[PDB]
Amino acid sequence: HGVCWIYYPDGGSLVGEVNEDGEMTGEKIAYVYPDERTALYGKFIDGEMIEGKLATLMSTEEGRPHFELMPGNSVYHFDKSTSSCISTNALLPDPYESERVYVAESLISSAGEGLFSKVAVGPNTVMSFYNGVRITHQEVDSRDWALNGNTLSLDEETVIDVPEPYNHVSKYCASLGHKANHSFTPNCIYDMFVHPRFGPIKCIRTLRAVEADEELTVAYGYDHSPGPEAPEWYQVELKAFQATQ
Amino acid sequence: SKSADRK
Ligand SMILES: Nc1ncnc2c1ncn2[C@@H]1O[C@H](CSCC[C@H](N)C(=O)O)[C@@H](O)[C@H]1O
């Protein structure tokens, strides 16, 4: 009975035959990443991934995709974080992100680790996902900056955080977006992303072509006239940036 | 406001 594709604004999609009630429910449903090639294929209920196995979208006939399964028993499920649990599988990487970025020492002095591109990509490419626990703006804005190194606003109601000890990739590597450092001249942006495992989160997307082994940076976008409400290191850099202008 | 990328 034919096949539906639902594209999110970020370029990922859900694809499959819908059931009698018109739900994306079945054994042969897939989520396809924004490369229109990497896919998680298997059992979904009402568009929610129950058992998605890593696959490649090879071709499409009369609108109907063909998937070849990748080796391994890489399987994924919808596993939205809570305020305390960042993931059921903190050490299981996202397979699309794995092929595109890695973590290494930042090239920015005294900035710890940073996120780097594995491959040359063009503009508008989703590179990495910023998943974390979900907490409130009230909580975040009421606590010390020391606790807010990794907080990223998701929307008016929710802030995503990667709190200790999940700021170390030895404890958490299911996503890596929290490892991109700040620049006032960035090559990437944060953008909304609907992820079949993490749910509604943000991703890191290039705004220009990037080379292999280039460090990926984003503007953190703190309020410069709430001086700035920002960590001291950012305040130093903001002064330098305005000076160059 | 103690988080990145607020609208
Ligand atoms: N431009 C910059 N200069 C110095 N420190 C930076 C920076 N951008 C990010 N940071 C550091 O990175 C933290 C945000 S998370 C980014 C990844 C982090 N460097 C890490 O190793 O896990 C900030 O708290 C700050 O410690």
Side-chain angles (χ1 to χ4, degrees), chain A residues 1-16 18-19 22 24-36 38-73 76-104 106-108 111-137 139-155 158-170 172-224 226-231 233-236 238-244, chain B residues 1-6:
Chain A
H1 218 274
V3 179
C4 295
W5 297 67
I6 299 163
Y7 284 83
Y8 299 119
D10 57 52
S13 54
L14 285 188
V15 56
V18 294
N19 74 1
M24 277 282 187
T25 297
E27 304 283 344
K28 294 162 81 181
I29 302 303
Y31 170 84
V32 188
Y33 283 94
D35 62 0
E36 296 179 335
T38 305
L40 306 178
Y41 171 62
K43 180 178 185 189
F44 285 66
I45 297 169
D46 194 19
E48 175 187 327
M49 183 168 66
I50 305 311
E51 177 181 56
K53 298 180 179 184
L54 183 62
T56 306
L57 170 55
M58 304 295 290
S59 61
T60 304
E61 184 73 13
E62 292 193 313
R64 185 184 290 273
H66 183 256
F67 296 106
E68 180 177 313
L69 293 184
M70 290 286 283
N73 286 315
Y76 307 87
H77 67 286
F78 177 61
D79 183 35
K80 192 177 171 179
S81 66
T82 65
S83 66
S84 59
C85 179
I86 193 164
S87 180
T88 299
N89 297 253
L91 301 177
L92 175 61
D94 180 278
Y96 169 96
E97 184 184 56
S98 293
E99 293 317 303
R100 285 164 181 77
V101 295
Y102 63 94
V103 172
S106 185
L107 298 176
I108 304 160
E113 285 175 337
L115 184 74
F116 291 77
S117 173
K118 270 197 190 180
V119 288
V121 306
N124 311 309
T125 300
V126 174
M127 295 298 275
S128 178
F129 298 113
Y130 202 127
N131 181 55
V133 302
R134 293 159 191 279
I135 57 186
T136 63
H137 282 281
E139 185 166 329
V140 168
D141 289 349
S142 301
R143 72 195 190 173
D144 197 267
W145 270 112
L147 298 207
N148 293 323
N150 289 349
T151 42
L152 173 72
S153 182
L154 180 63
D155 56 29
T158 302
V159 171
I160 280 162
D161 192 17
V162 185
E164 296 177 319
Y166 300 129
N167 61 310
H168 287 312
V169 309
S170 55
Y172 177 78
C173 64
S175 60
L176 297 177
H178 58 287
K179 290 281 169 179
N181 280 324
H182 165 82
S183 176
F184 293 108
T185 53
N187 55 15
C188 291
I189 52 133
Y190 295 122
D191 200 6
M192 303 296 172
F193 196 84
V194 186
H195 195 288
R197 173 186 178 181
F198 304 121
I201 52 160
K202 282 181 175 180
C203 71
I204 305 293
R205 180 183 291 273
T206 63
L207 58 76
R208 66 166 167 80
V210 305
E211 287 162 350
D213 304 304
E214 181 167 341
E215 183 160 16
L216 299 179
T217 58
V218 284
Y220 283 13
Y222 294 131
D223 194 340
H224 296 173
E229 183 64 76
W233 68 262
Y234 183 97
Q235 293 194 51
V236 174
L238 180 53
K239 260 107 129 282
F241 171 68
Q242 283 159 340
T244 84
Chain B
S1 66
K2 291 191 196 175
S3 58
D5 205 45
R6 180 89 188 87

